Amino acid sequence: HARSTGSYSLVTQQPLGGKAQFGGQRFGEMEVWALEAYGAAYTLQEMLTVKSDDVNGRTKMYKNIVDGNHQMEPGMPESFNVLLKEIRSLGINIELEDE
Amino acid sequence: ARVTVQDAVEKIGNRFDLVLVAARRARQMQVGGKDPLVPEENDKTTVIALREIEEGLINNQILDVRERQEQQE
Amino acid sequence: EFDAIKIALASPDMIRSWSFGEVKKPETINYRTFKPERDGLFCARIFGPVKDYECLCGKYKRLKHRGVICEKCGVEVTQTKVRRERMGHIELASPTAHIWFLKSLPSRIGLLLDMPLRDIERVLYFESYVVIEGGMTNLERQQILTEEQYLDALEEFGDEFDAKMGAEAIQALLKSMDLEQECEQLREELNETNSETKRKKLTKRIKLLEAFVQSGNKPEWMILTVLPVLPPDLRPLVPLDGGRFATSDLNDLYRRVINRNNRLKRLLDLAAPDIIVRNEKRMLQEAVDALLDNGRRGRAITGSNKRPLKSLADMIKGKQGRFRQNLLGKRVDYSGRSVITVGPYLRLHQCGLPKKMALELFKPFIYGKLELRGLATTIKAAKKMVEREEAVVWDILDEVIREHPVLLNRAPTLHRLGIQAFEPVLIEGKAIQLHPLVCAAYNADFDGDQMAVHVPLTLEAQLEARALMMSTNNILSPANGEPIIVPSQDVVLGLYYMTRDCVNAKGEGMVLTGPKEAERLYRSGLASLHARVKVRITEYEKDANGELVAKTSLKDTTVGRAILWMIVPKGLPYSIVNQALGKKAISKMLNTCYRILGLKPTVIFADQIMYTGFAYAARSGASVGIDDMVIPEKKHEIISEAEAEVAEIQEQFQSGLVTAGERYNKVIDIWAAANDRVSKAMMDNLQTETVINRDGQEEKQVSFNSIYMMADSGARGSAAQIRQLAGMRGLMAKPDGSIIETPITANFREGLNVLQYFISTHGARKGLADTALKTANSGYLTRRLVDVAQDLVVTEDDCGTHEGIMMTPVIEGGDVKEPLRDRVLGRVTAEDVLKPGTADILVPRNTLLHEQWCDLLEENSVDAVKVRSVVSCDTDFGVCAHCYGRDLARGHIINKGEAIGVIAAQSIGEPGTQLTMRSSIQVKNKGSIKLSNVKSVVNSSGKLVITSRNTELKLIDEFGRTKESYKVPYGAVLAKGDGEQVAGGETVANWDPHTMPVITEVSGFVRFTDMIDGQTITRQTDELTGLSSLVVLDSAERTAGGKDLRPALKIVDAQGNDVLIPGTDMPAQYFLPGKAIVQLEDGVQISSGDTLARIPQGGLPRVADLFEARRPKEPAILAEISGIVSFGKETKGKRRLVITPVDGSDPYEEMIPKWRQLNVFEGERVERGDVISDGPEAPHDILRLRGVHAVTRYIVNEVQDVYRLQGVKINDKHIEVIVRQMLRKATIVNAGSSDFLEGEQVEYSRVKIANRELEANGKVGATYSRDLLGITKASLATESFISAASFQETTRVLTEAAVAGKRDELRGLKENVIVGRLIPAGTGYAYHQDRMRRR
DNA sequence: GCCGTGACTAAAGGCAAAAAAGCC
RNA sequence: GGCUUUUUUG
DNA sequence: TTTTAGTCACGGC
Ligand SMILES: [Mg+2]
Ligand SMILES: [Zn+2]
Ligand SMILES: [Zn+2]
């Protein structure tokens, strides 16, 4: 099985799972720890933002590669905003702060 | 044609600074202009830069001074 | 973009500001057309348009209408993605209590209102009244009434007192309750009352009140009045195949809540009777409770599936929740998965990648090159050209995979070597070809394993892969210096067959020009692969100042070793490749190269080793046959003899001379001895063979048997397997654990009958079940080790502190488990090491000890070296480079920004799979006698008797080091003296194990005083022995008036006065405890220190409970403060003990169960942290008594003992790091001049920085006491709430953080992973330092 | 009546993969 | 296209 | 089911 770009989920905007749906391999928390054990931070930023769920950061990443450039933009993952709304859907107020 | 980075790691303090300076040099060489200082052998940009580091002709302060000189224009 | 994440309670005004409309109708969609309803749970007016730039009615569309509110439909024209952002609100007709704050583990409402949670639920459930305003009546503010109580009291007092019902009553009570005032009288009462049980409650209440006052929160916000509505797109109504629609569990709960609210609104406005109003309000409360968190109260409401529905709280908590499924680990693109096979033609830095997988993975890169060269103008043409699979596309793909690494990954990835970078090679097939040498790191076998490949995209990621991840850079374990490129199995057999001489072979005794000729002979067939020859070899040694010097000699060796010498690099000597080169030797060879020639020669040599081993293992043709398993000929005879033995005991058991248990033990011992003899005979038969030499005489040589070659070389198997293939399988155990009396006498080479094969499956099923159920437990532990120590990153070069821990070799009473060299290698000394010769500095302070210094340490025979440790570091929010020591993976000092906590956690947790779920003292060898802290005196007979508790036996050789260490009880017996050089095999210490002596102190005449006959002590003449003697009775016959009479035997000299011992004249009275029998009589001479009376009386779960520091079931009672032991009033349930300091006050009092063992007496002086009872040692007690520097050595010793028993090598500095995370808290005992409460717990770093920067000014600091917490508790009690909320107990953590108004400033690694930024470790450390420096 | 003890209640207990179903 | 229950591989 | 911990109610002198 292999996948470059396929169809994405509906709520978290992450790639689907399984061979039938042309999904990508899950990059679990153990692999996150393995990357943290190295000095790898840019690779982790890639796997978390520009390959999985940064909607505004992966469309530009595809355009950069076809243009010959190899550079990312950190963006902001869309799997964390939803969480905020979820916690904001309760009586709890969780918010970000100033620059 | 690069199988290890021992020479580059020895040339600079630690591996992380080597990664950062090599990334800066490779981006300078790749996005626009900045022809290599070493004869390439059909190598990728990330490899030509690393050799430049092991030759001792590129490090953090050299890149800084060249960038300052070019921005002074 | 954002500095930090702040959490606080939402306000009704704030909730109204969040929303963009009011949700009024339960209808979701029209369910006739495909259009959402109006003012529903999916309303377009509230949240947004369904389509992009398209209003509901279609009046306004396109970009020209952007930002224009359409009047016909009422929906603003904008992009549809806002449906994931905007929210709605529901105006509850009646106030509703939030479930969370009501029923967390500590009830927030209960603590705030000082009310038990039992009656609060009754009030909220409309089954009991509560007084709101007592007024001037006989009722209290917090008093609770029932239905009959309220009606009866209503008429008596009229309207003077006000009582309400339910959540409205709770809101009214909270709103009319002051905060600062209540805090004031709580503080005033705290200073007055003295109750330890009440003190913690008072501290909790005042802390909560201060947190509420300090934050902007108010109690009335804790009761919901307006309920926010989650956006539609996050709970989508996706259409499925058919008329039915796919709806989530959340929509049903929302519909239930809105329907109940509408019913209550319509019913309340019609002036309905209060009978129905109360029930409807309670039902609305239950519905909101189900929506917010389903199942906490009781029976969870279920749908048609009869399964509990998913609520908001359950959607976050758990393994399927957002935190552990979509934030920490997420699915990625540019990734593939396949089966791995073996490719022996690859280099160490390359892997095989199938053409189809490569073309699918590198699709975007190919498009860039394809359009760059003009082969395709538009992107569509490029896509069409790629799918058609032209010929130039293959050349382009070959071009774009020149030096583009890919990340190979195997799940589970237990350690950091489970993800490795490679340079792919385009191959056919559909399997990922993997280099054999890395298989040890991956823990992978080619029997169906699957691995996943990822692709770095940016330049930084590719460079990071090449410089940090690529397999040529990862050849040393992070847990220890041992390599991970050790050849095994096939290679080891080939190199063992190559380098193994035979006494007679083809072409023996000839002399060769050099190694090159040896290859021409073997290929030509003129000489066997291993014949003893004489060759000339040029070897290069680096004995100069890093310069190679040639050296020629004639060596007596074999053709195989000479051939192998052609691949070893320059620096190595010839003595390396002259032995048999088993598995353990070959690895050492590689290690030697890494010690001398660096990294590139090492990897080249490893590849050459693999190639040569594979080639000369293929050429050997080694095979296993049924004739290669030689059965010893004596075996059956031995078995018969063994049978005869049991044939005796079965008779002797029938004659009554042998009982059941001893017969069992005798049979087990006999069968074990027979099995051992059979194994020894089989090994002797197998390991040798007969062969005729050149002269014609029979000469013995080591055998060439194939099974012995695989067993001896270390390629596969061990002694046990070979024993089970030829010798008898041995004794087998029952599932419970009992050993079967009859062993399995048949090896696998011959048949096993039905009965033996059945009893041989008891062990196999047990092992399989343990293996199946141990993976779940071990991995969990790893998580609890990673989350506690995720945020420990090296941030300093040298903290400049002299504190350290004393590191000495460990001795358990036998051979030394670990030499001092390994426990100190790769560390730095806290202070200069002093030679035994005075004032000589062997080691300068703050110097890294490497192998070269360690060898110098060994030749000097150093005894003990003090070194720094992470637990002793004073750096705030991190650990400096020097205290950690040396980076084991690389070999140099640790670099700034390296995340060491995750490395330590993985190193500890990875070997957890190998663990399992289920008289006299004798000297071994020659050595002197040394006793540390000894106080021995010469008795009447002249022997040495010891009266010191902490006496340690020591064995000193001609060098000075110690090999053995033994502990002895009071009144020890020594056959020698101190400082003597005695020989081995000598018994010096001997004592009675099972009876405790009542030995005297000094020689003298024993006198009997206060001897009461008739009720206290009577002359019991036992008919069993018929001897009359003084006997102390039990506590049954005697009463409180007789038990208080303590029989004191005052030790006196010949003059009858108190003993004139050096220093004190206090009488040495010896109180006789219960059940004491006196054997001696009056007038019988007592030897010095002679007895007066003989008074009578685990693997992985162990590691998990040790790291958690779980309380043992029977803790050992120890001392509390140094001084003199004193007693007092007794029989107060337990026994009293009081310790009096020299000058300090002694108000301390504690109780000890008098019915348990007591190892201390009144006439003794005890030191702080000394054992009193016996049993397991609790970690908290040893922390509070012996200090922090002792608990950091007990836990390390215990866990290292476990791992070493299970045969696993882990460096000690990995366990210390974890300990540094358990000691992160501190309890404040005295407020002092600081601003800390006298009973609270604060971060140790916080209290240290507050103290260290305040005492520097014109003020004085405060005191504190470090406390030990389990990893589970220490991970939940952190400064950040995101990190703790992602681990466990999300509901509790979120509420506790919201009520206190905490803020998370994102300093950890996990909390930067979640938000999507570079972690502050490794390559991201430099970037974050610049960010911090700017701000 | 206050510190000690027993009873009542909540959280937690691998990682990846596939193949089926059946419901909503 | 989400959930649940089985079966199997490592 | 088992383990563990936190919290409410009871107990004995
Ligand atoms: Mg396998
Ligand atoms: Zn419209
Ligand atoms: Zn330090």
d(CA C205, CA C220): 18
d(CA C921, CA C973): 11
Q: Please spell the DSSP secondary structure of C602-620, one letter per residue.
A: HHHHHHHHHHHHHHHHHTT
d(CA C487, CA C482): 13
B14 interface with C at CB cutoff 8 Å:
yes
Resolution in A: 3.4
Whether C105 CB is under 7 Å from strand F: yes
Of C230, C458, C897, the CB nearest to A42: C458
Q: Which domain holds residue B46?
A: 6-72
**Chain A residue nearest residue C470, CA to CA:** A38
Buried b (16+ CB within 10 A) or exposed e, C1191-1211: bbbbbbebbbebbeeeebebb
Among all bound ligands, the one having the nearest atom to the CA of C442 is 1
Residues in A 21-50 with any Cβ partner in C closer than 8 A: 23-50
d(CA A75, CA A56): 7
Query: Does the residue B1 lie in any domain?
Result: no
B31 interface with A at CB cutoff 8 Å:
yes
d(CA C1240, CA C1237): 6
Q: Token pair 């025979």 is at which residue? A: C861
* CB neighbour class for C179 (10 Å; exposed up to 12, middle 13-18, buried from 19): middle
How many Å does it take to go from CA C46 to C1' D24?
A: 26
Torsion of CA C1101, C1106, C1110, C1116, to 10 degrees: 120
State the helix-helix crossing angle for C490-498 and C583-596, rounded to 10 degrees.
90
d(CA C972, CA C970): 6
Q: Rounded to the nearest whole angstrom, what is the distance from the C-alpha of residue C892 to the centroid of ligand 3?
A: 17
| Length of chain A, in residues | 99
What string of H, E and C letters represents the secondary structure of C1192-1205?
A: HHHHHHHHHHHHHH
d(CA C386, CA C355): 13
Q: Token pair 């380098």 is at which residue? A: C499
Which residues partner with C763 through β-bridges?
none
Residues 900-919 of C with CB under 7 A from strand F: none
How many Å does it take to go from CA C784 to C1' D14?
A: 12
Q: C499, C579 in Cβ contact below 8 A?
A: yes
d(CA C821, CA C1060): 49
Residues of chain C contacting B9 with CB distance shorter than 8 Å? 467
Q: C1153, C1135 in Cβ contact below 8 A?
A: yes
Residues A51, C478, C859, CA angle at the centre, nearest 5°? 165
How many Å does it take to go from CA C1297 to C1' D1?
A: 37
List CB contacts of C1278: < 8 A, sequence separation 6 or more.
C1284
CB contact under 8 A, B19 and A71: no
Residues of chain B contacting A67 with CB distance shorter than 8 Å? none
Listed residue (C207, C163, C111) closest to C1238, CA to CA: C207
Q: C161, C133 in Cβ contact below 8 A?
A: yes
Shortest distance between the Cα of B61 and any Cα of chain A, in A, equals 22
Q: C929, C962 in Cβ contact below 8 A?
A: no
d(CA C437, CA C474): 12
Which residues partner with C350 through β-bridges?
C423
Q: C377, C371 in Cβ contact below 8 A?
A: yes
Cα-flanking dihedrals φ and ψ of residue C609, to 5°? -60, -45
d(CA C99, CA C205): 20
CA–chain centroid gap for C1248, Å, is 27
d(CA C697, CA C691): 9
Chain C residues at the B interface, defined by Cβ less than 8 Å, are: 347, 349, 402-404, 459-460, 462-464, 466-468, 472-473, 598-600, 603, 895-897, 1322-1323, 1325-1326
* Token digits of residue C1099: 């693997």
Which residues partner with C733 through β-bridges?
C739
* Token digits of residue C1003: 């020689």
Listed residue (C263, C175, C155) closest to C219, CA to CA: C175
Is residue C461 within a helix (H) or strand (E), and if so which, with residue range? helix C459-464
Architecture of domain C920-990 in CATH? Beta Barrel (2.40)
Which residues partner with C331 through β-bridges?
A26
Residues 208-247 of C with CB under 7 A from strand E: 238, 240-241, 246
Buried b (16+ CB within 10 A) or exposed e, C1026-1041: eeeebbbbeeeebeee
d(CA C344, CA C612): 11
**R_g over Cα of chain B:** 12
d(CA A31, CA A48): 12
For residue B48, what is the domain's CATH number? Answer: 3.90.940.10
Q: C495, C488 in Cβ contact below 8 A?
A: no
Cβ atoms within 10 Å of C1147's Cβ, excluding its own: 6
Q: C116, C255 in Cβ contact below 8 A?
A: no
**Chain B residue nearest residue A72, CA to CA:** B27
CB contact under 8 A, B16 and C403: no
How many Å does it take to go from CA A18 to C1' D18?
A: 8
Q: Please spell the DSSP secondary structure of B30-73, one letter per residue.
A: HHS----SS--SS--HHHHHHHHHHTTS--HHHHHHHHHHHHT-
d(CA C84, CA C738): 64
Coil/strand/helix, residue C1246: helix
Q: Please spell the DSSP secondary structure of C181-196, one letter per residue.
A: HHHHHHHHHHHH---H
| Length of chain B, in residues | 73
Chains B, C: CB contacts within 8 A come to 70
How many Å does it take to go from CA C198 to C1' D3?
A: 11
Q: C434, C411 in Cβ contact below 8 A?
A: no
**Chain C residue nearest residue B47, CA to CA:** C403
What does DSSP say about strands C987-990 and C920-922: parallel, antiparallel, or unpaired?
antiparallel
State the helix-helix crossing angle for C363-372 and C379-387, rounded to 10 degrees.
120
Of C402, C468, C472, the CB nearest to B4: C472
Q: B62, B56 in Cβ contact below 8 A?
A: no
Residues C503, C504, C507, CA angle at the centre, nearest 5°? 125
* CB neighbour class for C1111 (10 Å; exposed up to 12, middle 13-18, buried from 19): middle
**Chain B residue nearest residue A71, CA to CA:** B27
CA–chain centroid gap for C152, Å, is 62
Residue C387: C-alpha distances to residues C90, C360, C367 (Å): 53, 10, 12
Cα-flanking dihedrals φ and ψ of residue C1015, to 5°? -135, -25
Fill in the amino acid letter for C248.
Answer: S
Q: C1078, C1094 in Cβ contact below 8 A?
A: no
Residue C1329: C-alpha distances to residues C699, C895, C1026, C1324 (Å): 73, 15, 87, 9
d(CA C329, CA A30): 8
| Length of chain C, in residues | 1335
CB contact under 8 A, B23 and C460: yes
Torsion of CA C134, C135, C136, C138, to 10 degrees: -10
Residues of chain C contacting A24 with CB distance shorter than 8 Å? 331-335
CB contact under 8 A, B23 and C895: no
d(CA A31, CA A28): 5
Coil/strand/helix, residue A78: helix
* Token digits of residue C516: 């090159």
What does DSSP say about strands C144-145 and C350-354: parallel, antiparallel, or unpaired?
unpaired
Cβ atoms within 10 Å of C669's Cβ, excluding its own: 11
Fill in the amino acid letter for C544.
Answer: A
List CB contacts of C1291: < 8 A, sequence separation 6 or more.
C100, C104, C293, C313, C317
* CB neighbour class for C36 (10 Å; exposed up to 12, middle 13-18, buried from 19): buried
Q: A36, A42 in Cβ contact below 8 A?
A: no
Mutate to test the interface with A, among C332, C793, C1288, C1330 (most CBs of A within 10 A): C332
Residues of chain C contacting A65 with CB distance shorter than 8 Å? 364-365, 367-368, 457
CA–chain centroid gap for C705, Å, is 45
CB contact under 8 A, C457 and A65: yes
Q: A45, C1318 in Cβ contact below 8 A?
A: yes
Listed residue (C682, C678, C640, C668) closest to C743, CA to CA: C668
**What would you measure as the largest C-alpha separation in chain A, in angstroms?**
48
Give me the long-range contacts of C556-559 (CB less than 8 A, separation at least 24). Answer: C556/C532, C557/C532, C557/C533, C558/C499, C558/C500, C558/C501, C558/C530, C558/C531, C558/C532, C558/C533, C559/C507, C559/C518, C559/C521, C559/C522, C559/C527, C559/C528, C559/C529, C559/C530, C559/C531, C559/C533
Total domains present in chain B: 1
Chains in contact with A, where contact requires at least 3 CB pairs less than 8 Å apart: B, C
* CB neighbour class for C149 (10 Å; exposed up to 12, middle 13-18, buried from 19): middle
DSSP classification of residue C1116: P
Residue C1225: C-alpha distances to residues B47, C425, C879, C1242 (Å): 48, 52, 16, 6
How many Å does it take to go from CA A7 to C1' F10?
A: 63
Cα separation of the two ends of chain B = 37
Q: What is the residue extent of each domain of chain A?
A: 14-99
Q: C150, C141 in Cβ contact below 8 A?
A: no
CA–chain centroid gap for C510, Å, is 60
Of C333, C903, C1309, the CB nearest to A24: C333
d(CA C864, CA C240): 74
* Token digits of residue C1249: 């920085």
Of B16, B19, B31, the CB nearest to A69: B31
Cα-flanking dihedrals φ and ψ of residue C1017, to 5°? -130, 130
Fill in the amino acid letter for C1064.
Answer: T
Shortest distance between the Cα of B55 and any Cα of chain A, in A, equals 24
Listed residue (C346, C418, C826, C413) closest to C603, CA to CA: C346
Cβ atoms within 10 Å of C1302's Cβ, excluding its own: 19
Q: Rounded to the nearest whole angstrom, what is the distance from the C-alpha of residue C341 to the centroid of ligand 1?
A: 12
Listed residue (C1173, C1182, C1183, C1213) closest to C1196, CA to CA: C1213
Whether C1275 CB is under 7 Å from strand D: no
* Token digits of residue C65: 């209408």
Residues C1256, C830, C1177, CA angle at the centre, nearest 5°? 95
Q: C622, C706 in Cβ contact below 8 A?
A: yes
Listed residue (C575, C571, C565) closest to C595, CA to CA: C571
Which fold is adopted by the domain C633-766? Answer: Topoisomerase I; Chain A, domain 4 (1.10.132)
d(CA C748, CA C629): 10
Helix, strand, coil fractions of chain C, as percent rounded to 5? 35, 20, 45
Residues of C marked as binding? 55, 57, 70, 73, 445, 447, 449, 799, 873, 880, 883
Residue nearest to nucleotide F4 (CA to C1'): C1110
Shortest distance between the Cα of B19 and any Cα of chain C, in A, equals 6
List CB contacts of C196: < 8 A, sequence separation 6 or more.
none
Q: C52, C275 in Cβ contact below 8 A?
A: no
**Chain C residue nearest residue B6, CA to CA:** C599
d(CA C319, CA C301): 22
Residue A63: C-alpha distances to residues A41, B28, C38, C387, C586 (Å): 23, 19, 40, 20, 51
Q: C1202, C1102 in Cβ contact below 8 A?
A: yes
Coil/strand/helix, residue C1136: strand
* CB neighbour class for C300 (10 Å; exposed up to 12, middle 13-18, buried from 19): middle
Of A35, A48, A61, the CB nearest to C330: A48
Shortest distance between the Cα of A63 and any Cα of chain C, in A, equals 9
* Token digits of residue C532: 């003893």
d(CA C829, CA C834): 11
How many Å does it take to go from CA C1132 to C1' F12?
A: 11
Whether C337 CB is under 7 Å from strand E: no
d(CA C902, CA C1218): 10
Residue C175: C-alpha distances to residues C13, C131, C1157, C1298 (Å): 16, 14, 58, 19
Q: Token pair 């779980």 is at which residue? A: C1110
d(CA A55, CA C574): 62
Residue nearest to nucleotide F12 (CA to C1'): C1133
List CB contacts of C150: < 8 A, sequence separation 6 or more.
C129, C163
Which residues partner with C226 through β-bridges?
C91
Which residues partner with C149 through β-bridges?
none
Whether C333 CB is under 7 Å from strand D: no
d(CA A8, CA C260): 37
Whether A47 CB is under 7 Å from strand E: no
